[PDB]
């Protein structure tokens, strides 16, 4: 009934304990009641040591007592005589990495843990001798469906802190003056209050921004909404790091376009741990498939024919979401194979017991259902090669051999990371078919065709942006091959005049000699 959070000086109460219980016998495990400043406390003897361990001893004037608060006790002890402060760890005792359910992101997690949590788990006393603040932010970016939100959620339920607040996109905007800023300010109030109350002992707080690029844009750039967005950005900047200091927060943001976010918001002392989540390699695919097919193996629902290594090999440039969808479709096929009710839903039982997902389901689903965004597409070749290839003379063989030589050079060289080639001839000679037969036999993990007939009626800027998008996508694979056909149609050339689009020509000329990032 009399529990209070007010601090208690262990030194004064220890001196009072010595005064009251001098020349008195005490034994290990002895239970008693101590009155300090009219406050009653339950004391239990834990260990005794002669000035050697002794079960029973006599308290004397120079006896030393060290006090530690009981487990789950709200007692606030302050002093140096106390030895155990019972600082509750900031991590749930149950957690271990394997149960997180994330595969193919070992290095990134290692870096985040080192740079953001290393200082919240080392013994506090050592930390206090360095006088260092804690990091205050993390930023995540990458292509869609690679596992950002998953990591944010897993981190959120990592810690022993309270539940994390969530902001779903631009759910803070409002029409009346001075309402958005109020919504922004409402978020930090609990942290400010707890800080003021408890100082260094406050618990941790977490805030998660979703699609942060929809709110924080460079100041002075946009038009038509400069006032509102400027006010929001200024309010956020002031709150995160202002005149009054906070030391018990952590902010996580995630976006798809890391370039639009203001610059003053990404300096040390603010969101300063930037990470990139990219496509996985072979080991990552193997780990993800292992994670997503554990329960079935446990319950013996998985046939003995399936070999996970083969599936890992055969799926190239896949992303996590697609690896999940593949398994889901494979399971749905088997589940439907037993149910048989077109007229009215009618489940069976005889073979609803021996459910077995087989290799055939995996293959059939892989060839019909999933279509990776960065993979190779086959309908394109069907459309662009409508009557096959006819060997009517040596020149065909010559051209194909030259294409093969170029492909081999670009795959084995190191001093020439970029190559080019031009195919030309009289009209109605069939250049496009040959180009799309030299791309198909390339055997690269990424192929694409950029044809004018997908841009009918576009203006110059639209065409420029489309080509730029294609090349940006191509820049994210260990290999690639892009076909640009009918250049004159792209340029809108007409002999009268002459007339043409200068902007597209300049864009193409620049792009033709830009090297990709290192190693690709």
């Amino acid at each position: 009934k009399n529990i209070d959070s007010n601090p208690y000086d262990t030194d004064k109460m220890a001196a009072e304990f010595i005064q009251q219980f001098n020349n008195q016998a005490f034994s290990v495990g002895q239970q008693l009641v101590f009155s300090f400043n009219d406050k009653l406390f339950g004391l239990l003897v834990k260990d005794i040591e002669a000035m050697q361990k002794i079960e029973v001893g006599l308290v004397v004037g120079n006896s030393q007592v060290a006090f530690e608060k009981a487990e789950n006790s709200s007692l606030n002890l302050i002093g140096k005589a106390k030895t155990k402060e019972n600082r509750q760890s900031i991590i749930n005792p149950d957690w271990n990495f394997e149960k997180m359910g994330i595969g193919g992101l070992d290095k990134e997690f290692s870096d985040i843990f080192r740079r953001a949590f290393a200082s919240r788990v080392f013994p506090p006393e050592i930390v206090e001798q360095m006088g260092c603040k804690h990091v205050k932010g993390i930023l995540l970016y990458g292509p869609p469906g690679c596992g950002k939100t998953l990591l944010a959620r897993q981190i959120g339920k990592m810690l022993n802190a309270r539940e994390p607040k969530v902001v779903n996109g631009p759910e803070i905007l409002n029409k009346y003056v001075g309402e958005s800023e109020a919504n922004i300010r409402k978020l930090f109030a609990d942290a400010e209050e707890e800080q003021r109350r408890l100082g260094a002992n406050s618990g941790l707080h977490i805030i998660i921004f979703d699609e942060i690029d929809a709110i924080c844009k460079q100041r002075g750039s946009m038009a038509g909404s400069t006032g509102v967005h400027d006010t929001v950005v200024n309010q956020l900047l002031s709150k995160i790091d202002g005149v009054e200091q906070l030391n018990n927060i952590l902010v996580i943001g995630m976006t798809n376009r890391p370039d639009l976010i203001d610059e003053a918001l990404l300096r040390p002392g603010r969101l300063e741990v930037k990470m990139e989540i990219g496509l996985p390699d072979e080991k990552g695919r193997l780990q993800i498939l292992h994670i997503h097919t554990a329960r079935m193996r446990g319950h013996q629902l998985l046939s003995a024919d399936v070999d996970i290594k083969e599936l890992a090999v055969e799926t190239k440039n896949f992303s996590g979401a697609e690896l999940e969808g593949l398994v889901r479709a494979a399971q749905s096929t088997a589940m439907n194979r037993h149910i048989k009710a077109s007229t009215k839903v009618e489940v069976d039982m005889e073979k609803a017991e021996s459910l077995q997902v087989t290799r055939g389901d995996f293959l059939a689903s892989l060839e019909n259902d999933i279509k990776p965004a960065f993979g190779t597409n086959q309908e394109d070749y069907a459309s662009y090669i409508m009557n096959g290839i006819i060997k009517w003379g040596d020149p065909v063989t010559r051209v194909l051999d030259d294409g093969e030589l170029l492909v081999q050079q670009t795959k084995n060289s190191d001093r020439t990371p970029l190559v080019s080639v031009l195919l030309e001839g009289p009209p109605h000679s069939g250049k496009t078919a040959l180009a799309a037969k030299i791309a198909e036999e390339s055997n690269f993990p990424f192929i694409k065709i950029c044809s004018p007939d997908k841009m009918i009626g576009f203006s110059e800027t639209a065409k420029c942006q489309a080509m730029k998008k294609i090349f940006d996508d191509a820049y994210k694979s260990q290999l690639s091959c892009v076909v640009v056909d009918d250049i004159e149609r792209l340029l809108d050339y007409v002999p009268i005049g002459p007339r043409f689009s200068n902007l597209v020509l300049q864009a193409l000329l620049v792009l033709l000699k830009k090297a990709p990032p290192q190693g690709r």
Binding site: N174, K175, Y176, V177, G178, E179, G227, V228
Partner: protein, 43 residues
């Protein structure tokens, strides 16, 4: 679109009224008489 717009003026509305207060006086007056009566009985 439209920049943030100001809100319009407010028009409050008082509740109690003179005549309703005469009615509340009607309510209150009988209580004192009833009190005189009960005090008499107790005495």
């Amino acid at each position: 679109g439209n920049p943030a717009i100001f809100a319009s003026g407010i028009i409050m509305d008082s509740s109690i009224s003179k005549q309703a207060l005469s009615e509340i006086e009607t309510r209150h007056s009988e209580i004192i008489k009833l009190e005189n009566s009960i005090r008499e009985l107790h005495d």
